[PDB]
Amino acid sequence: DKKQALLEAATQAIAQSGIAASTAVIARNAGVAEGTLFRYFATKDELINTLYLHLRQDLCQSLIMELDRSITDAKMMMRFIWNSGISWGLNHPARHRAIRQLAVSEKLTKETHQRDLDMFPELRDILHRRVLMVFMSDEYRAFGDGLFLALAETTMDFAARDPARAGEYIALGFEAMWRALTRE
């Protein structure tokens, strides 16, 4: 599948180099001509948006399959989601870094954000109820995502380096993020 090879190649290149990764380099590492990349993605912006949703879907498969939903308290559910996302990101550091590079890019469309939210309805509902309004807004969502992902990456880095304390770092990082980004 040329498209799957392109998505994997875009993941690695955008993780490494951000959205400034050129469509010509992505094509080469996928083993195809650049016109072939545009054969599957009309523009680079479409590739950015398609890749983002592809990576979010991969993450969400882990978040949802793992979700202990004997849980109805929102913060408890979010802690579980956080823990699962930490595990996913440590297992897939390039996929996680690509999500972060794409999320802070301001290239993601309204349709992409809507589909992203709707892929995981329980998470969506909690974010709309609890995240500070400015960080769900079109104007500042990318900044809210940037702050969230900065705290997530720091938590992952410390957990990876000091596994004896990993559970404590993950808990403290979740709690700091929760205070920073949510309101009662």
Residues that bind ligand EV1 (CB under 6 A): 59, 78, 81-82, 85-86, 89, 96, 99, 123, 127, 131, 148, 152, 181-182
Radius of gyration in angstroms for the set of CA atoms belonging to the chain, rounded to a whole number: 17
Exactly one of 16, 24, 134, 167 binds its own copies (CB under 8 A); that residue is 134
Secondary structure E strands in 121-183: none
Applying CB under 8 A, the site for its own copies has a residue count of 27
- CA 116-170-121 angle, to 5 degrees, is 25
Residue 182: helix, strand or coil by DSSP?
strand
The distance of closest approach from Cβ of residue 42 to ligand EV1 in the complex, given in angstroms and rounded to an integer, is 26
Q: Please name the amino acid found at residue 69.
A: R
Q: Is 69 exposed, middle or buried (0-12, 13-18, 19+ CB in 10 A)?
A: exposed
Residue 113: helix, strand or coil by DSSP?
helix
Taking the least distance from each CB to ligand EV1, the nearer of 21 and 103 is 103
Interacting span for its own copies (CB under 8 A) from 34-42, 64-72, 81-89, 176-184: 176-184
Residues in touch with its own copies (CB under 8 A):
104, 106, 134-135, 139-140, 142-143, 146-147, 150-151, 153-154, 157-158, 162, 165, 168-169, 172-173, 176-177, 179-181
